[PDB]
Short mmCIF file of C-alpha atoms and ligand atoms in Angstrom, two decimals:
data_model
loop_
_atom_site.label_atom_id
_atom_site.label_comp_id
_atom_site.label_asym_id
_atom_site.label_seq_id
_atom_site.Cartn_x
_atom_site.Cartn_y
_atom_site.Cartn_z
CA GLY D 8 -0.22 -0.39 -0.05
CA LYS D 9 1.47 3.61 -0.48
CA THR D 10 -1.16 4.80 1.97
CA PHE D 11 -1.13 4.83 5.83
CA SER D 12 -1.78 7.38 8.73
CA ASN D 13 0.50 8.96 11.21
CA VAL D 14 3.10 6.90 10.77
CA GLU D 15 5.84 9.26 13.53
CA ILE D 16 9.18 10.69 11.65
CA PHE D 17 10.30 11.99 15.32
CA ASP D 18 10.06 11.74 18.88
CA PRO D 19 11.96 14.88 20.40
CA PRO D 20 14.05 14.04 23.49
CA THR D 21 12.65 14.85 26.97
CA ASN D 22 14.89 17.84 27.59
CA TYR D 23 14.39 20.13 24.61
CA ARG D 24 12.54 22.80 24.71
CA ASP D 25 8.91 23.61 24.78
CA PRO D 26 7.64 23.32 22.48
CA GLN D 27 10.64 20.35 20.69
CA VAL D 28 9.46 20.38 17.89
CA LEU D 29 6.87 22.56 15.06
CA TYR D 30 6.99 23.37 11.20
CA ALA D 31 7.36 20.66 9.65
CA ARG D 32 9.05 20.61 6.29
CA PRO D 33 8.57 17.66 3.40
CA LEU D 34 10.06 17.92 0.08
CA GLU D 35 10.02 15.08 -2.82
CA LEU D 36 13.21 14.66 -5.14
CA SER D 37 13.26 13.62 -9.12
CA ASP D 38 14.73 10.30 -8.29
CA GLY D 39 11.82 9.21 -5.86
CA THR D 40 13.53 10.04 -2.03
CA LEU D 41 11.45 12.16 0.41
CA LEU D 42 13.32 14.88 2.50
CA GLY D 43 11.85 15.99 5.93
CA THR D 44 12.96 18.93 8.79
CA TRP D 45 11.05 20.88 10.95
CA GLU D 46 12.56 23.57 13.78
CA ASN D 47 14.38 21.28 16.32
CA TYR D 48 14.28 23.25 19.48
CA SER D 49 17.22 21.61 21.27
CA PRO D 50 18.93 22.43 24.48
CA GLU D 51 22.51 24.95 23.61
CA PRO D 52 25.07 24.82 23.08
CA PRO D 53 25.74 23.24 20.42
CA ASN D 54 23.51 25.91 18.90
CA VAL D 55 20.23 24.16 16.89
CA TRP D 56 20.50 23.03 13.93
CA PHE D 57 17.87 21.84 10.95
CA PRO D 58 17.49 17.93 10.82
CA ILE D 59 16.65 16.29 7.68
CA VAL D 60 15.48 13.02 7.70
CA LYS D 61 15.16 11.01 4.24
CA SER D 62 12.50 8.16 3.14
CA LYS D 63 13.26 5.91 0.07
CA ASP D 64 9.89 4.22 0.42
CA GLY D 65 7.51 7.45 0.11
CA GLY D 66 7.11 7.89 3.94
CA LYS D 67 6.60 4.49 5.48
CA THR D 68 10.33 5.04 7.54
CA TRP D 69 12.45 7.75 8.02
CA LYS D 70 16.44 7.69 8.84
CA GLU D 71 18.40 11.09 9.68
CA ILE D 72 21.10 11.33 7.37
CA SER D 73 22.23 14.77 8.93
CA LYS D 74 21.84 18.07 10.06
CA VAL D 75 21.58 22.02 8.42
CA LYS D 76 24.00 23.85 10.86
CA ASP D 77 24.84 28.03 11.30
CA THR D 78 28.11 27.98 10.26
CA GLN D 79 27.92 31.73 9.59
CA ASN D 80 26.84 33.56 12.78
CA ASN D 81 26.91 31.22 16.19
CA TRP D 82 23.51 32.05 16.19
CA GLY D 83 22.17 28.26 15.12
CA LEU D 84 18.99 27.95 12.60
CA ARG D 85 15.91 28.03 15.00
CA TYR D 86 12.98 28.72 12.93
CA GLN D 87 11.05 28.08 9.98
CA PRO D 88 12.67 26.10 7.53
CA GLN D 89 11.80 25.28 4.03
CA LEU D 90 12.96 22.72 1.65
CA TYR D 91 13.34 23.59 -1.98
CA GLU D 92 14.95 20.79 -5.18
CA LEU D 93 16.22 23.59 -8.18
CA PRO D 94 14.05 22.41 -10.86
CA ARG D 95 16.94 24.81 -13.38
CA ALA D 96 20.31 26.08 -12.72
CA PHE D 97 21.38 28.70 -11.05
CA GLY D 98 24.23 30.56 -11.04
CA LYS D 99 26.62 27.76 -9.55
CA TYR D 100 24.22 25.90 -7.99
CA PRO D 101 23.29 23.00 -11.34
CA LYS D 102 19.94 21.54 -11.32
CA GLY D 103 18.81 19.03 -8.33
CA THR D 104 20.60 21.32 -6.03
CA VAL D 105 18.52 21.14 -2.86
CA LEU D 106 18.01 24.43 -0.75
CA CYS D 107 17.64 25.20 2.52
CA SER D 108 16.67 28.05 3.62
CA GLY D 109 15.14 29.42 7.28
CA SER D 110 16.00 32.09 9.44
CA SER D 111 19.30 32.18 12.14
CA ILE D 112 18.61 33.51 15.64
CA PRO D 113 20.76 33.89 18.29
CA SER D 114 18.94 32.38 21.63
CA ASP D 115 18.29 35.53 23.13
CA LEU D 116 15.87 36.48 20.02
CA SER D 117 17.44 39.77 19.19
CA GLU D 118 18.19 39.13 16.07
CA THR D 119 16.13 37.49 12.57
CA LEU D 120 18.00 36.15 9.55
CA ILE D 121 16.45 34.42 6.62
CA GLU D 122 19.64 32.74 5.30
CA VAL D 123 20.09 29.79 2.19
CA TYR D 124 22.30 26.19 2.84
CA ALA D 125 22.85 23.65 -0.38
CA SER D 126 23.25 20.70 -0.50
CA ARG D 127 24.93 18.87 -4.13
CA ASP D 128 24.44 15.17 -2.83
CA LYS D 129 20.63 15.09 -2.19
CA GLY D 130 20.69 16.17 1.06
CA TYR D 131 23.26 14.89 2.98
CA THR D 132 25.78 17.61 2.89
CA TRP D 133 25.08 21.33 3.42
CA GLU D 134 27.35 24.18 2.20
CA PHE D 135 26.61 28.18 3.14
CA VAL D 136 25.08 30.15 -0.06
CA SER D 137 24.07 33.03 1.48
CA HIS D 138 22.67 36.06 3.50
CA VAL D 139 19.28 37.06 2.08
CA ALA D 140 17.17 39.03 4.64
CA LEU D 141 18.09 40.53 8.14
CA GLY D 142 15.65 41.36 11.03
CA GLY D 143 15.07 42.36 14.62
CA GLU D 144 13.36 41.02 17.43
CA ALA D 145 12.75 37.88 16.80
CA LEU D 146 8.57 38.20 18.70
CA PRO D 147 5.76 38.43 16.42
CA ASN D 148 4.73 42.47 18.74
CA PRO D 149 3.13 45.41 16.84
CA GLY D 150 6.89 47.76 16.52
CA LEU D 151 9.90 44.47 16.77
CA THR D 152 11.44 44.76 13.10
CA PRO D 153 11.31 40.77 12.68
CA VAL D 154 11.55 39.07 9.05
CA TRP D 155 10.00 34.76 9.36
CA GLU D 156 8.59 32.07 7.28
CA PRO D 157 10.73 31.88 3.87
CA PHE D 158 9.18 29.91 0.80
CA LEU D 159 10.74 29.61 -2.19
CA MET D 160 9.77 29.01 -5.77
CA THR D 161 11.68 29.49 -9.21
CA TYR D 162 9.72 31.58 -12.20
CA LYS D 163 10.83 31.74 -15.72
CA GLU D 164 15.04 32.15 -15.40
CA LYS D 165 14.67 33.95 -11.59
CA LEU D 166 13.83 32.26 -8.38
CA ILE D 167 11.86 33.63 -5.50
CA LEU D 168 11.96 33.98 -2.03
CA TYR D 169 9.04 35.29 -0.12
CA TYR D 170 8.63 35.90 3.38
CA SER D 171 6.35 37.60 6.47
CA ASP D 172 8.08 41.28 6.36
CA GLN D 173 7.97 43.20 9.43
CA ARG D 174 10.44 46.04 8.78
CA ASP D 175 8.37 48.45 7.81
CA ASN D 176 6.98 48.85 11.09
CA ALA D 177 5.99 52.75 10.80
CA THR D 178 3.49 52.03 7.88
CA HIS D 179 2.68 47.64 9.18
CA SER D 180 2.61 46.02 11.80
CA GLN D 181 3.48 42.78 9.22
CA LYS D 182 3.39 42.75 5.63
CA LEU D 183 4.07 40.31 3.06
CA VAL D 184 6.58 40.11 0.78
CA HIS D 185 9.49 38.45 -1.70
CA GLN D 186 13.24 39.38 -3.39
CA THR D 187 14.02 37.50 -6.41
CA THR D 188 17.55 36.12 -8.05
CA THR D 189 19.35 34.53 -10.90
CA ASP D 190 22.48 32.73 -8.76
CA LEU D 191 21.06 32.18 -5.90
CA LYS D 192 23.80 34.84 -4.28
CA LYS D 193 22.83 38.74 -5.46
CA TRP D 194 19.13 39.69 -4.11
CA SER D 195 16.93 41.74 -5.67
CA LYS D 196 15.41 44.90 -3.52
CA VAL D 197 12.65 43.97 -1.55
CA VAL D 198 9.45 44.05 -3.64
CA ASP D 199 6.09 44.04 -1.81
CA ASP D 200 3.69 41.04 -1.92
CA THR D 201 0.50 41.96 -0.04
CA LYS D 202 0.11 44.67 2.49
CA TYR D 203 -3.28 46.53 4.27
CA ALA D 204 -2.90 49.48 4.99
CA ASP D 205 -4.28 49.27 8.91
CA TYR D 206 -1.04 48.90 10.27
CA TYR D 207 -2.11 46.78 13.19
CA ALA D 208 -3.25 44.12 9.99
CA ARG D 209 -0.56 41.33 9.92
CA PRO D 210 -1.30 38.98 7.04
CA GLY D 211 1.82 36.46 7.15
CA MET D 212 2.85 33.23 6.05
CA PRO D 213 3.57 32.41 2.84
CA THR D 214 2.78 29.77 0.01
CA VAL D 215 2.75 29.25 -3.64
CA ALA D 216 1.15 26.59 -6.18
CA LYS D 217 1.25 27.09 -10.25
CA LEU D 218 -1.83 26.78 -11.46
CA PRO D 219 -2.82 24.22 -15.08
CA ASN D 220 -4.27 27.96 -16.54
CA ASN D 221 -1.19 29.51 -16.18
CA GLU D 222 -1.98 31.65 -13.24
CA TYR D 223 -0.29 30.80 -9.43
CA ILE D 224 -2.26 31.00 -6.60
CA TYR D 225 -0.93 32.69 -3.45
CA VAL D 226 -1.67 31.59 0.13
CA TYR D 227 -1.52 34.02 3.30
CA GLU D 228 -2.83 34.13 6.85
CA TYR D 229 -4.78 37.87 7.39
CA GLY D 230 -4.55 38.46 10.75
CA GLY D 231 -6.76 41.03 11.71
CA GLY D 232 -8.86 40.33 8.44
CA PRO D 233 -12.37 41.41 8.83
CA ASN D 234 -15.14 39.85 10.68
CA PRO D 235 -13.25 37.73 13.72
CA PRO D 236 -15.77 34.61 14.89
CA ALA D 237 -17.77 36.20 18.64
CA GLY D 238 -15.39 36.33 21.52
CA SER D 239 -12.07 37.48 19.17
CA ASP D 240 -11.44 40.81 18.10
CA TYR D 241 -8.62 39.62 16.33
CA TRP D 242 -7.80 36.51 13.90
CA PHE D 243 -6.03 34.92 11.14
CA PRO D 244 -8.60 33.66 8.03
CA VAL D 245 -6.71 31.79 4.85
CA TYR D 246 -7.39 34.42 1.86
CA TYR D 247 -5.42 33.88 -1.33
CA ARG D 248 -4.35 35.80 -5.01
CA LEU D 249 -4.73 34.86 -8.31
CA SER D 250 -2.06 36.28 -10.73
CA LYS D 251 0.17 35.20 -14.61
CA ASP D 252 3.03 36.87 -13.03
CA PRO D 253 3.72 35.37 -9.03
CA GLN D 254 6.11 38.24 -8.73
CA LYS D 255 2.67 41.03 -9.23
CA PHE D 256 0.40 39.75 -6.22
CA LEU D 257 -0.78 42.72 -4.28
CA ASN D 258 -2.75 44.52 -7.36
CA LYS D 259 -4.48 41.59 -7.19
CA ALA D 260 -8.55 41.02 -5.61
CA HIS D 261 -8.39 38.76 -2.48
CA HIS D 262 -10.67 36.38 -1.47
CA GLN D 263 -10.93 34.45 1.81
CA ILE D 264 -11.50 30.77 2.19
CA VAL D 265 -14.95 29.30 3.03
CA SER D 266 -15.83 25.91 1.83
CA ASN D 267 -19.94 24.77 1.24
CA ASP D 268 -20.85 24.65 4.83
CA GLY D 269 -19.59 27.57 5.68
CA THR D 270 -15.75 27.03 7.23
CA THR D 271 -13.49 29.33 7.33
CA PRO D 272 -10.34 28.42 8.02
CA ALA D 273 -7.81 30.18 9.48
CA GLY D 274 -3.92 30.33 11.00
CA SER D 275 -1.15 29.50 9.24
CA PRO D 276 -2.19 27.78 5.52
CA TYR D 277 0.00 26.21 3.07
CA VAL D 278 -1.17 25.25 -0.48
CA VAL D 279 -0.05 22.59 -2.92
CA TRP D 280 -1.42 22.23 -6.64
CA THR D 281 -1.30 18.27 -8.18
CA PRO D 282 -2.54 17.50 -11.82
CA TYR D 283 -4.86 14.76 -9.91
CA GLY D 284 -8.62 15.44 -10.61
CA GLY D 285 -9.46 16.55 -13.26
CA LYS D 286 -9.02 19.04 -16.05
CA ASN D 287 -8.28 22.10 -13.43
CA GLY D 288 -6.10 19.56 -11.14
CA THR D 289 -6.86 20.61 -7.19
CA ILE D 290 -5.28 22.93 -5.24
CA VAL D 291 -5.32 21.32 -1.58
CA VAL D 292 -4.85 23.78 1.29
CA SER D 293 -4.06 23.17 4.91
CA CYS D 294 -4.49 25.19 7.85
CA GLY D 295 -3.39 25.75 11.34
CA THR D 296 -6.17 25.11 13.08
CA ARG D 297 -7.99 22.64 11.91
CA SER D 298 -7.38 19.20 10.93
CA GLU D 299 -10.09 19.02 7.51
CA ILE D 300 -7.94 19.40 3.87
CA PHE D 301 -9.75 22.30 1.35
CA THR D 302 -10.20 22.03 -1.55
CA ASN D 303 -10.50 22.72 -5.04
CA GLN D 304 -11.43 21.67 -8.48
CA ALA D 305 -12.25 25.50 -10.06
CA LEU D 306 -8.51 27.80 -10.67
CA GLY D 307 -9.79 29.11 -6.93
CA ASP D 308 -13.41 30.37 -8.10
CA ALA D 309 -14.05 31.41 -5.07
CA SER D 310 -17.66 29.39 -4.26
CA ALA D 311 -15.84 26.08 -5.33
CA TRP D 312 -13.69 25.37 -1.88
CA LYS D 313 -14.40 21.62 -0.35
CA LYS D 314 -13.22 20.67 2.40
CA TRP D 315 -12.43 16.71 3.39
CA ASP D 316 -11.74 14.97 6.79
CA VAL D 317 -8.12 13.22 6.81
CA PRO D 318 -6.12 10.96 9.29
CA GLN D 319 -3.38 13.52 9.90
CA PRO D 320 -4.56 15.88 13.29
CA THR D 321 -4.78 19.36 13.73
CA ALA D 322 -0.73 21.12 13.55
CA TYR D 323 1.05 24.57 13.53
CA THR D 324 1.50 25.44 10.05
CA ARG D 325 0.68 21.80 9.52
CA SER D 326 2.90 21.34 5.33
CA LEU D 327 1.25 19.02 1.94
CA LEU D 328 2.89 17.72 -0.66
CA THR D 329 2.15 15.51 -3.76
CA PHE D 330 3.77 12.82 -5.02
CA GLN D 331 4.96 13.72 -9.11
CA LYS D 332 4.15 9.71 -9.86
CA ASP D 333 1.68 9.81 -8.55
CA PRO D 334 -0.38 13.09 -8.22
CA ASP D 335 -3.28 11.35 -6.40
CA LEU D 336 -0.98 10.47 -2.98
CA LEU D 337 -0.84 13.66 -0.62
CA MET D 338 1.64 14.11 1.77
CA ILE D 339 0.06 16.20 5.34
CA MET D 340 3.20 16.46 7.34
CA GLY D 341 2.82 18.21 11.10
CA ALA D 342 4.99 18.89 14.20
CA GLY D 343 2.60 19.68 16.38
CA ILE D 344 0.81 22.71 18.26
CA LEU D 345 2.87 26.60 19.51
CA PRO D 346 3.05 26.09 23.26
CA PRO D 347 3.17 25.70 25.84
CA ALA D 348 3.21 22.29 23.72
CA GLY D 349 2.82 20.57 26.60
CA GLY D 350 4.90 18.63 26.11
CA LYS D 351 2.88 16.28 23.03
CA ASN D 352 4.54 17.54 19.72
CA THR D 353 5.89 14.73 17.68
CA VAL D 354 7.07 14.87 13.95
CA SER D 355 4.96 12.58 11.46
CA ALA D 356 2.71 12.02 8.54
CA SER D 357 0.18 10.27 7.04
CA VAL D 358 0.23 9.87 2.97
CA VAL D 359 -3.82 9.47 1.60
CA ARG D 360 -5.14 9.31 -1.64
CA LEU D 361 -7.38 12.44 -2.87
CA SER D 362 -9.70 9.71 -4.80
CA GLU D 363 -10.68 8.38 -1.50
CA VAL D 364 -10.60 11.28 0.14
CA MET D 365 -12.61 13.27 -1.35
CA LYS D 366 -16.27 11.21 -0.94
O1 LIG C 401 7.98 29.66 13.98
C1 LIG C 401 8.15 29.50 15.41
C2 LIG C 401 6.95 30.83 15.58
O2 LIG C 401 7.17 32.18 15.02
C3 LIG C 401 6.97 33.17 15.94
O3 LIG C 401 5.85 33.74 14.92
C4 LIG C 401 6.11 34.37 13.86
C5 LIG C 401 4.94 34.67 13.66
O4 LIG C 401 4.05 33.32 13.19
C6 LIG C 401 2.97 33.75 12.01
O5 LIG C 401 1.88 33.88 12.69
C7 LIG C 401 3.18 35.19 11.67
O6 LIG C 401 3.80 35.78 10.29
C8 LIG C 401 5.12 35.66 12.30
O7 LIG C 401 4.40 37.03 12.96
C9 LIG C 401 6.95 32.53 17.01
O8 LIG C 401 6.98 33.33 18.23
C10 LIG C 401 7.04 31.24 17.78
O9 LIG C 401 5.78 30.58 17.80
#
């Protein structure tokens, strides 16, 4: 069988710091191998690292094959890891190089630094590549200037790195931006992807997927979005935008995700698209406060969102991956909840079939 539920990837030592683990991310390589990483809250020193686990049987079993370490700052690689495989060469880094981006942060949380590291041997060894974005104190409070949450994607001859940015702290509590590169060393000026005029709004957590009508869907949580539910005065509903040019979401109309039964997903979303289910494929979205997946088989039409149960539990920024040799297969991977986590977080995954789940 290719499907499985709740297979454990990592059970953290008892001495790891709340939340112990968080922010799981998967990656499929062109040879079918899977890589996985997460925020790894070990007792320091040594400075924290991003572990790299590898599966050769479609995620049934896993083994750690390396650690991505901060070799530049004597801080550690601490938050918001993101794995990505180059689909083409950039500068001296050929097609098939594995990138691991993430934020390097000293233990005292006084600064944030989004880095790119590269592996030329499919995840066994790593080398620093470049510093992308420096920010201030790593607490999500209005007025601080941190940067967070890198997400990578290619577009033609460019690689784009999307992230969350609090540096414009006289105008936006947080906004969403990107930089681009053609060689993985020189990065463009910051470009805005999504921002709202009320200072207290905090759009965050960008992820992106390519649709088969040559548009891209750009998904994020809209901190401070309208109509918080009774008894809340600030929430993080999931919104998205559509654009033929993925450098230009800023000027595109936004849409909230709401399923046909009225469910409003919120918190730390993650989107993928898979060439399965019909001529438009299937867009799949997870959010960080519910266990279901949300699907759209109409290229992001706002009235076509569906919702389906899966056996993988709710988790912060629960992530998604679709298998290139079988688009019907969906991996859902998580590393538990935001602290306080009560010592309960583990890193785990399920593989489901959209054909079975979508009934
Ligand atoms: O990833 C660990 C997590 O990051 C910090 O918050 C960042 C905050 O999270 C999103 O919801 C927003 O885009 C961003 O400002 C937390 O302090 C830490 O637990």
